[PDB]
Amino acid sequence: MLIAFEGIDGSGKTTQAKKLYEYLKQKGYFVSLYREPGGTKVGEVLREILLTEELDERTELLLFEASRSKLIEEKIIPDLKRDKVVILDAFVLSTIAYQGYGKGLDVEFIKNLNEFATRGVKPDITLLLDIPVDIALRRLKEKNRFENKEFLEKVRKGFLELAKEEENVVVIDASGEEEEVFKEILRALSGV
Amino acid sequence: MLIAFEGIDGSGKTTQAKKLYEYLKQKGYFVSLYREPGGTKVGEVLREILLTEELDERTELLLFEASRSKLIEEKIIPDLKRDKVVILDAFVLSTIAYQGYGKGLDVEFIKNLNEFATRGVKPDITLLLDIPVDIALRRLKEKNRFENKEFLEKVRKGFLELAKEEENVVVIDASGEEEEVFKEILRALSVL
């Protein structure tokens, strides 16, 4: 079973994946939680790079996909094999939304690269934690993270446009309060 | 002007690009020399990763492409703009030969990914420094590098098959002695 959280920064998706992780463990599932980029020794090194350096959009994309390629081959495919429930703090939609809708690279091309990195592995369900950029920035403003409104507006739109057109996506209102957001999610997972 | 050296390990291609670099500089060209993977701060960090870590083929290919992409944007395109002669110790044909003909990934896919990392920049000439694997392994045996014959045989074949089918490729016999190899190359470069 593979469960992907997706959405912009400040959407609480990390909080909510950690939430869903602890919950499913208490219900006696065997569970993994991985963040993208990251989740492996090599994936973390790349993540640091992607957070450190002045990188163009093409290079950035190739590194997101490398991290993903690592994650999929090292952890996800063997976790899935042994029936772990695998929870992802970010996955393929986000590459399309950030690097395609955001930074202008070809969406079809990003999709084929996502297929290559994943070896065709797709989530059973994707939770999009949608939120207005206005609200997300207010929430980030409290951790003193400042991010680009004009940019995140595009990325939001992409994420919303991928919900309509990509397969097995549920939009969740993440502007709600923590426990209400978690109940939307548990509701959405009644899917399986 | 862009000049690419390609070929298996122990083909001398590094020695020869350094050779060609010093020469063209002496003849009053403004010249750059860059190795792949590497040639940029980020590219070197990746190269170390590619030399350090147990990496699957899909991941390795994304990291080669990333190094490239960084190289192309940070250095090659602006060096080309100001009429530097740009010399490369490895380029696109090698990703095909190692990752496709060697490790079984789809060639057409490797090509489209090269095009992306290169923004469509192609060498005016590629020197393939061809050599039997037998010879190349003897030569590396004197630096105490040991590499996989069965593997390099495929890669050699790939490199040779690309010379026939890809554009602007000159095969150079690199089994010869240094100075004779250098004269083959200066002959091949006759855009003098």
GROMACS .gro file of C-alpha atoms in nm:
model
  384
    1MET     CA    1   0.000   0.000   0.000
    2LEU     CA    2   0.145   0.339  -0.108
    3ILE     CA    3   0.007   0.674   0.023
    4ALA     CA    4   0.140   1.004  -0.111
    5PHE     CA    5   0.099   1.347   0.052
    6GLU     CA    6   0.145   1.638  -0.192
    7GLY     CA    7   0.109   2.014  -0.169
    8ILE     CA    8   0.288   2.344  -0.131
    9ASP     CA    9   0.498   2.456   0.160
   10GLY     CA   10   0.300   2.542   0.472
   11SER     CA   11   0.016   2.307   0.378
   12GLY     CA   12   0.094   2.098   0.690
   13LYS     CA   13   0.154   1.787   0.479
   14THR     CA   14   0.464   1.684   0.681
   15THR     CA   15   0.273   1.717   1.007
   16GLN     CA   16  -0.013   1.514   0.862
   17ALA     CA   17   0.207   1.232   0.718
   18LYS     CA   18   0.376   1.197   1.062
   19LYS     CA   19   0.022   1.196   1.202
   20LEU     CA   20  -0.092   0.921   0.966
   21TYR     CA   21   0.230   0.729   1.027
   22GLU     CA   22   0.176   0.708   1.411
   23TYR     CA   23  -0.190   0.629   1.371
   24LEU     CA   24  -0.151   0.336   1.123
   25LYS     CA   25   0.127   0.195   1.346
   26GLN     CA   26  -0.108   0.199   1.644
   27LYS     CA   27  -0.370   0.014   1.426
   28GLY     CA   28  -0.104  -0.258   1.374
   29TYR     CA   29   0.016  -0.182   1.020
   30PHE     CA   30   0.386  -0.200   0.942
   31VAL     CA   31   0.470   0.150   0.823
   32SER     CA   32   0.737   0.353   0.655
   33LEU     CA   33   0.760   0.727   0.618
   34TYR     CA   34   0.986   0.895   0.367
   35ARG     CA   35   1.031   1.252   0.252
   36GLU     CA   36   1.120   1.372  -0.102
   37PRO     CA   37   1.386   1.473  -0.170
   38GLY     CA   38   1.556   1.257   0.093
   39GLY     CA   39   1.482   0.932   0.274
   40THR     CA   40   1.811   0.764   0.187
   41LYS     CA   41   2.179   0.844   0.258
   42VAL     CA   42   2.225   0.961  -0.100
   43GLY     CA   43   1.883   1.132  -0.113
   44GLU     CA   44   1.973   1.343   0.192
   45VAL     CA   45   2.305   1.451   0.044
   46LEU     CA   46   2.112   1.568  -0.268
   47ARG     CA   47   1.848   1.740  -0.059
   48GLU     CA   48   2.113   1.945   0.115
   49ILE     CA   49   2.249   2.039  -0.230
   50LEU     CA   50   1.900   2.142  -0.350
   51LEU     CA   51   1.855   2.358  -0.036
   52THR     CA   52   2.214   2.496  -0.044
   53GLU     CA   53   2.307   2.592  -0.401
   54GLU     CA   54   2.213   2.828  -0.680
   55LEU     CA   55   2.080   2.567  -0.928
   56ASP     CA   56   1.908   2.606  -1.261
   57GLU     CA   57   1.573   2.433  -1.313
   58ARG     CA   58   1.705   2.151  -1.533
   59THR     CA   59   1.974   2.052  -1.290
   60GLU     CA   60   1.730   2.078  -1.002
   61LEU     CA   61   1.486   1.845  -1.176
   62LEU     CA   62   1.755   1.585  -1.245
   63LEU     CA   63   1.853   1.584  -0.879
   64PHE     CA   64   1.484   1.556  -0.755
   65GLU     CA   65   1.451   1.261  -0.989
   66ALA     CA   66   1.785   1.105  -0.868
   67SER     CA   67   1.676   1.124  -0.510
   68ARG     CA   68   1.349   0.964  -0.615
   69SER     CA   69   1.527   0.698  -0.811
   70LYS     CA   70   1.725   0.618  -0.500
   71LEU     CA   71   1.431   0.609  -0.273
   72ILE     CA   72   1.226   0.386  -0.501
   73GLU     CA   73   1.497   0.126  -0.555
   74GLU     CA   74   1.651   0.125  -0.207
   75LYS     CA   75   1.337   0.150   0.014
   76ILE     CA   76   0.995   0.175  -0.153
   77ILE     CA   77   0.992  -0.130  -0.379
   78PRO     CA   78   1.125  -0.364  -0.103
   79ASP     CA   79   0.885  -0.204   0.161
   80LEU     CA   80   0.595  -0.261  -0.075
   81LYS     CA   81   0.701  -0.619  -0.137
   82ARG     CA   82   0.676  -0.702   0.236
   83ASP     CA   83   0.337  -0.530   0.262
   84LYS     CA   84   0.454  -0.223   0.455
   85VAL     CA   85   0.226   0.076   0.422
   86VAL     CA   86   0.456   0.337   0.264
   87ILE     CA   87   0.386   0.703   0.334
   88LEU     CA   88   0.549   0.980   0.126
   89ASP     CA   89   0.591   1.345   0.226
   90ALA     CA   90   0.594   1.461  -0.141
   91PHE     CA   91   0.605   1.260  -0.462
   92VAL     CA   92   0.562   1.282  -0.841
   93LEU     CA   93   0.295   1.551  -0.862
   94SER     CA   94   0.516   1.795  -0.686
   95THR     CA   95   0.795   1.769  -0.944
   96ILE     CA   96   0.537   1.851  -1.215
   97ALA     CA   97   0.387   2.139  -1.013
   98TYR     CA   98   0.720   2.299  -0.902
   99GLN     CA   99   0.943   2.240  -1.212
  100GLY     CA  100   0.672   2.237  -1.483
  101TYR     CA  101   0.389   2.470  -1.375
  102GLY     CA  102   0.625   2.679  -1.167
  103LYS     CA  103   0.949   2.704  -1.361
  104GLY     CA  104   0.827   2.635  -1.714
  105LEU     CA  105   0.976   2.294  -1.807
  106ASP     CA  106   0.774   2.056  -2.017
  107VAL     CA  107   0.510   1.868  -1.822
  108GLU     CA  108   0.508   1.563  -2.052
  109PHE     CA  109   0.881   1.538  -2.014
  110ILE     CA  110   0.863   1.566  -1.636
  111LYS     CA  111   0.598   1.286  -1.635
  112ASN     CA  112   0.820   1.049  -1.837
  113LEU     CA  113   1.110   1.118  -1.610
  114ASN     CA  114   0.881   1.041  -1.308
  115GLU     CA  115   0.790   0.710  -1.472
  116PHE     CA  116   1.164   0.628  -1.515
  117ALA     CA  117   1.254   0.708  -1.154
  118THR     CA  118   0.966   0.519  -1.010
  119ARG     CA  119   0.987   0.220  -1.246
  120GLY     CA  120   0.613   0.272  -1.301
  121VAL     CA  121   0.527   0.250  -0.929
  122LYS     CA  122   0.219   0.470  -0.862
  123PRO     CA  123   0.035   0.555  -0.534
  124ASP     CA  124  -0.286   0.373  -0.448
  125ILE     CA  125  -0.406   0.718  -0.337
  126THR     CA  126  -0.265   1.070  -0.342
  127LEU     CA  127  -0.372   1.323  -0.083
  128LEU     CA  128  -0.338   1.677  -0.212
  129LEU     CA  129  -0.332   1.909   0.089
  130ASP     CA  130  -0.458   2.225  -0.091
  131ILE     CA  131  -0.442   2.567   0.075
  132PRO     CA  132  -0.445   2.926  -0.040
  133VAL     CA  133  -0.091   3.068  -0.082
  134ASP     CA  134  -0.204   3.362   0.144
  135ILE     CA  135  -0.270   3.117   0.432
  136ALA     CA  136   0.039   2.903   0.366
  137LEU     CA  137   0.262   3.213   0.377
  138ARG     CA  138   0.101   3.327   0.708
  139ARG     CA  139   0.176   2.985   0.860
  140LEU     CA  140   0.536   2.989   0.728
  141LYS     CA  141   0.576   3.350   0.849
  142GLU     CA  142   0.552   3.207   1.208
  143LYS     CA  143   0.853   2.976   1.150
  144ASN     CA  144   1.017   3.279   0.975
  145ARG     CA  145   1.012   3.109   0.632
  146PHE     CA  146   0.939   3.362   0.359
  147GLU     CA  147   0.851   3.235   0.013
  148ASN     CA  148   0.752   3.376  -0.321
  149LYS     CA  149   0.380   3.436  -0.355
  150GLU     CA  150   0.384   3.485  -0.735
  151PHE     CA  151   0.559   3.149  -0.773
  152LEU     CA  152   0.349   2.943  -0.531
  153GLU     CA  153   0.030   3.074  -0.702
  154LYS     CA  154   0.138   2.898  -1.021
  155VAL     CA  155   0.236   2.585  -0.828
  156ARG     CA  156  -0.096   2.571  -0.645
  157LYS     CA  157  -0.273   2.593  -0.984
  158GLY     CA  158  -0.061   2.310  -1.121
  159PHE     CA  159  -0.130   2.089  -0.818
  160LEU     CA  160  -0.504   2.163  -0.853
  161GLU     CA  161  -0.485   2.098  -1.229
  162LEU     CA  162  -0.313   1.764  -1.166
  163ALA     CA  163  -0.588   1.654  -0.920
  164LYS     CA  164  -0.853   1.682  -1.200
  165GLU     CA  165  -0.654   1.511  -1.470
  166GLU     CA  166  -0.412   1.261  -1.294
  167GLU     CA  167  -0.537   0.933  -1.141
  168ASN     CA  168  -0.641   0.860  -0.776
  169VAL     CA  169  -0.615   1.210  -0.635
  170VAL     CA  170  -0.827   1.346  -0.349
  171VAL     CA  171  -0.809   1.716  -0.273
  172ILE     CA  172  -0.817   1.789   0.102
  173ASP     CA  173  -0.882   2.135   0.245
  174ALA     CA  174  -0.566   2.193   0.452
  175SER     CA  175  -0.665   2.547   0.566
  176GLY     CA  176  -0.865   2.371   0.841
  177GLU     CA  177  -0.729   2.298   1.189
  178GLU     CA  178  -0.500   2.001   1.247
  179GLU     CA  179  -0.743   1.748   1.378
  180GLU     CA  180  -1.009   1.840   1.119
  181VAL     CA  181  -0.752   1.804   0.840
  182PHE     CA  182  -0.656   1.458   0.979
  183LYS     CA  183  -1.025   1.351   0.976
  184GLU     CA  184  -1.063   1.460   0.610
  185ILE     CA  185  -0.763   1.237   0.539
  186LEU     CA  186  -0.873   0.933   0.732
  187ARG     CA  187  -1.202   0.981   0.550
  188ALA     CA  188  -1.020   0.990   0.214
  189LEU     CA  189  -0.827   0.674   0.297
  190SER     CA  190  -1.157   0.485   0.349
  191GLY     CA  191  -1.083   0.432  -0.023
  192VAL     CA  192  -0.870   0.147   0.124
  193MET     CA  193   3.390   2.577  -3.094
  194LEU     CA  194   3.322   2.259  -2.903
  195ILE     CA  195   3.541   1.952  -2.908
  196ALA     CA  196   3.451   1.626  -2.731
  197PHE     CA  197   3.680   1.339  -2.628
  198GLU     CA  198   3.501   1.008  -2.576
  199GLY     CA  199   3.604   0.652  -2.497
  200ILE     CA  200   3.649   0.381  -2.236
  201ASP     CA  201   3.876   0.404  -1.942
  202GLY     CA  202   4.251   0.367  -2.019
  203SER     CA  203   4.196   0.503  -2.373
  204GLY     CA  204   4.419   0.802  -2.279
  205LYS     CA  205   4.146   1.049  -2.356
  206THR     CA  206   4.224   1.259  -2.050
  207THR     CA  207   4.592   1.285  -2.135
  208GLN     CA  208   4.500   1.382  -2.488
  209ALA     CA  209   4.247   1.650  -2.399
  210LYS     CA  210   4.508   1.806  -2.164
  211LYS     CA  211   4.745   1.776  -2.463
  212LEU     CA  212   4.505   1.947  -2.699
  213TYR     CA  213   4.429   2.209  -2.437
  214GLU     CA  214   4.801   2.320  -2.396
  215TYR     CA  215   4.858   2.316  -2.771
  216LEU     CA  216   4.548   2.533  -2.869
  217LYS     CA  217   4.637   2.777  -2.591
  218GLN     CA  218   4.994   2.803  -2.734
  219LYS     CA  219   4.834   2.869  -3.079
  220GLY     CA  220   4.656   3.166  -2.915
  221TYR     CA  221   4.296   3.021  -2.878
  222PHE     CA  222   4.110   3.097  -2.555
  223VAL     CA  223   4.042   2.752  -2.423
  224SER     CA  224   3.852   2.567  -2.148
  225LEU     CA  225   3.879   2.210  -2.041
  226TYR     CA  226   3.615   2.027  -1.852
  227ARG     CA  227   3.562   1.668  -1.743
  228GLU     CA  228   3.235   1.481  -1.714
  229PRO     CA  229   3.108   1.417  -1.458
  230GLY     CA  230   3.256   1.719  -1.281
  231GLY     CA  231   3.387   2.061  -1.406
  232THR     CA  232   3.165   2.268  -1.161
  233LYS     CA  233   3.148   2.283  -0.783
  234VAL     CA  234   2.820   2.085  -0.788
  235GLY     CA  235   2.941   1.844  -1.063
  236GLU     CA  236   3.241   1.746  -0.851
  237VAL     CA  237   3.024   1.671  -0.547
  238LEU     CA  238   2.817   1.443  -0.774
  239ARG     CA  239   3.123   1.282  -0.929
  240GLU     CA  240   3.249   1.182  -0.584
  241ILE     CA  241   2.900   1.038  -0.514
  242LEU     CA  242   2.914   0.839  -0.846
  243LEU     CA  243   3.263   0.709  -0.752
  244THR     CA  244   3.179   0.648  -0.382
  245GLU     CA  245   2.833   0.481  -0.366
  246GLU     CA  246   2.649   0.164  -0.454
  247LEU     CA  247   2.409   0.316  -0.710
  248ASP     CA  248   2.159   0.159  -0.943
  249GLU     CA  249   2.172   0.247  -1.311
  250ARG     CA  250   1.873   0.474  -1.322
  251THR     CA  251   2.003   0.682  -1.037
  252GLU     CA  252   2.357   0.696  -1.182
  253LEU     CA  253   2.218   0.819  -1.517
  254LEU     CA  254   2.021   1.104  -1.351
  255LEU     CA  255   2.333   1.214  -1.162
  256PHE     CA  256   2.548   1.206  -1.490
  257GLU     CA  257   2.276   1.409  -1.654
  258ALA     CA  258   2.261   1.656  -1.364
  259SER     CA  259   2.641   1.709  -1.367
  260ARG     CA  260   2.612   1.769  -1.735
  261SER     CA  261   2.324   2.006  -1.700
  262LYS     CA  262   2.513   2.208  -1.445
  263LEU     CA  263   2.820   2.210  -1.673
  264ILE     CA  264   2.624   2.316  -1.976
  265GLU     CA  265   2.459   2.613  -1.810
  266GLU     CA  266   2.723   2.729  -1.567
  267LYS     CA  267   3.028   2.702  -1.809
  268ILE     CA  268   2.983   2.563  -2.160
  269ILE     CA  269   2.717   2.795  -2.293
  270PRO     CA  270   2.880   3.111  -2.166
  271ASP     CA  271   3.233   2.987  -2.283
  272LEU     CA  272   3.086   2.923  -2.626
  273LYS     CA  273   2.929   3.263  -2.636
  274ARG     CA  274   3.265   3.433  -2.588
  275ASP     CA  275   3.430   3.214  -2.853
  276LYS     CA  276   3.637   2.996  -2.620
  277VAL     CA  277   3.736   2.662  -2.764
  278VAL     CA  278   3.570   2.418  -2.523
  279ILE     CA  279   3.721   2.084  -2.473
  280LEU     CA  280   3.546   1.793  -2.294
  281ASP     CA  281   3.696   1.486  -2.132
  282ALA     CA  282   3.368   1.279  -2.187
  283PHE     CA  283   3.023   1.381  -2.315
  284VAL     CA  284   2.692   1.253  -2.440
  285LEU     CA  285   2.811   0.948  -2.628
  286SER     CA  286   2.952   0.804  -2.320
  287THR     CA  287   2.623   0.815  -2.118
  288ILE     CA  288   2.475   0.614  -2.409
  289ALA     CA  289   2.760   0.367  -2.416
  290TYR     CA  290   2.794   0.303  -2.043
  291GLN     CA  291   2.419   0.332  -1.933
  292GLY     CA  292   2.254   0.199  -2.251
  293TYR     CA  293   2.488  -0.049  -2.424
  294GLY     CA  294   2.643  -0.141  -2.098
  295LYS     CA  295   2.376  -0.143  -1.829
  296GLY     CA  296   2.069  -0.198  -2.053
  297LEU     CA  297   1.869   0.130  -2.031
  298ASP     CA  298   1.685   0.255  -2.332
  299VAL     CA  299   1.906   0.439  -2.580
  300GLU     CA  300   1.636   0.666  -2.719
  301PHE     CA  301   1.557   0.769  -2.363
  302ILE     CA  302   1.922   0.839  -2.282
  303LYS     CA  303   1.945   1.053  -2.602
  304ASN     CA  304   1.636   1.265  -2.513
  305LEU     CA  305   1.771   1.313  -2.167
  306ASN     CA  306   2.118   1.426  -2.316
  307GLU     CA  307   1.926   1.679  -2.531
  308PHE     CA  308   1.763   1.821  -2.216
  309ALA     CA  309   2.083   1.847  -2.017
  310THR     CA  310   2.257   2.002  -2.318
  311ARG     CA  311   1.972   2.234  -2.423
  312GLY     CA  312   2.047   2.093  -2.765
  313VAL     CA  313   2.417   2.197  -2.773
  314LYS     CA  314   2.620   1.944  -2.982
  315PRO     CA  315   2.997   1.922  -3.042
  316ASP     CA  316   3.132   2.052  -3.376
  317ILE     CA  317   3.349   1.731  -3.366
  318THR     CA  318   3.373   1.423  -3.137
  319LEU     CA  319   3.701   1.229  -3.115
  320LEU     CA  320   3.640   0.872  -3.025
  321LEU     CA  321   3.961   0.739  -2.877
  322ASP     CA  322   3.908   0.369  -2.958
  323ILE     CA  323   4.114   0.093  -2.808
  324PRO     CA  324   4.078  -0.278  -2.741
  325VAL     CA  325   3.964  -0.357  -2.390
  326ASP     CA  326   4.266  -0.595  -2.360
  327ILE     CA  327   4.499  -0.297  -2.410
  328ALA     CA  328   4.298  -0.056  -2.194
  329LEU     CA  329   4.302  -0.303  -1.901
  330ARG     CA  330   4.682  -0.355  -1.938
  331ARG     CA  331   4.721   0.027  -1.926
  332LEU     CA  332   4.504   0.062  -1.617
  333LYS     CA  333   4.671  -0.240  -1.457
  334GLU     CA  334   4.993  -0.013  -1.435
  335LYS     CA  335   4.796   0.247  -1.226
  336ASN     CA  336   4.646  -0.054  -1.036
  337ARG     CA  337   4.292   0.013  -1.170
  338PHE     CA  338   4.108  -0.312  -1.235
  339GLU     CA  339   3.791  -0.305  -1.438
  340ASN     CA  340   3.541  -0.548  -1.580
  341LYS     CA  341   3.632  -0.685  -1.921
  342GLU     CA  342   3.284  -0.832  -1.998
  343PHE     CA  343   3.137  -0.486  -1.936
  344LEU     CA  344   3.385  -0.270  -2.127
  345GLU     CA  345   3.343  -0.501  -2.425
  346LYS     CA  346   2.978  -0.400  -2.456
  347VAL     CA  347   3.064  -0.034  -2.398
  348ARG     CA  348   3.333  -0.036  -2.663
  349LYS     CA  349   3.085  -0.182  -2.909
  350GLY     CA  350   2.835   0.090  -2.813
  351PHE     CA  351   3.091   0.366  -2.870
  352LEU     CA  352   3.186   0.209  -3.206
  353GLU     CA  353   2.820   0.170  -3.309
  354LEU     CA  354   2.756   0.539  -3.214
  355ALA     CA  355   3.046   0.662  -3.439
  356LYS     CA  356   2.870   0.506  -3.746
  357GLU     CA  357   2.523   0.631  -3.662
  358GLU     CA  358   2.574   0.962  -3.469
  359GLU     CA  359   2.694   1.282  -3.630
  360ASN     CA  360   3.044   1.438  -3.661
  361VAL     CA  361   3.234   1.147  -3.508
  362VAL     CA  362   3.593   1.057  -3.594
  363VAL     CA  363   3.734   0.728  -3.464
  364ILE     CA  364   4.097   0.760  -3.359
  365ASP     CA  365   4.315   0.458  -3.293
  366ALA     CA  366   4.429   0.521  -2.930
  367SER     CA  367   4.633   0.196  -2.896
  368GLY     CA  368   4.916   0.389  -3.061
  369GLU     CA  369   5.179   0.584  -2.870
  370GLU     CA  370   5.102   0.923  -2.720
  371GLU     CA  371   5.253   1.150  -2.980
  372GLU     CA  372   5.112   0.945  -3.270
  373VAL     CA  373   4.769   0.952  -3.111
  374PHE     CA  374   4.809   1.331  -3.070
  375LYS     CA  375   4.886   1.367  -3.445
  376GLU     CA  376   4.586   1.155  -3.544
  377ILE     CA  377   4.372   1.403  -3.343
  378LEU     CA  378   4.530   1.720  -3.481
  379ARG     CA  379   4.471   1.563  -3.819
  380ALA     CA  380   4.105   1.495  -3.730
  381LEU     CA  381   4.056   1.855  -3.613
  382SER     CA  382   4.166   1.989  -3.953
  383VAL     CA  383   3.809   2.305  -3.831
  384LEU     CA  384   4.177   2.418  -3.777
   0.00000   0.00000   0.00000
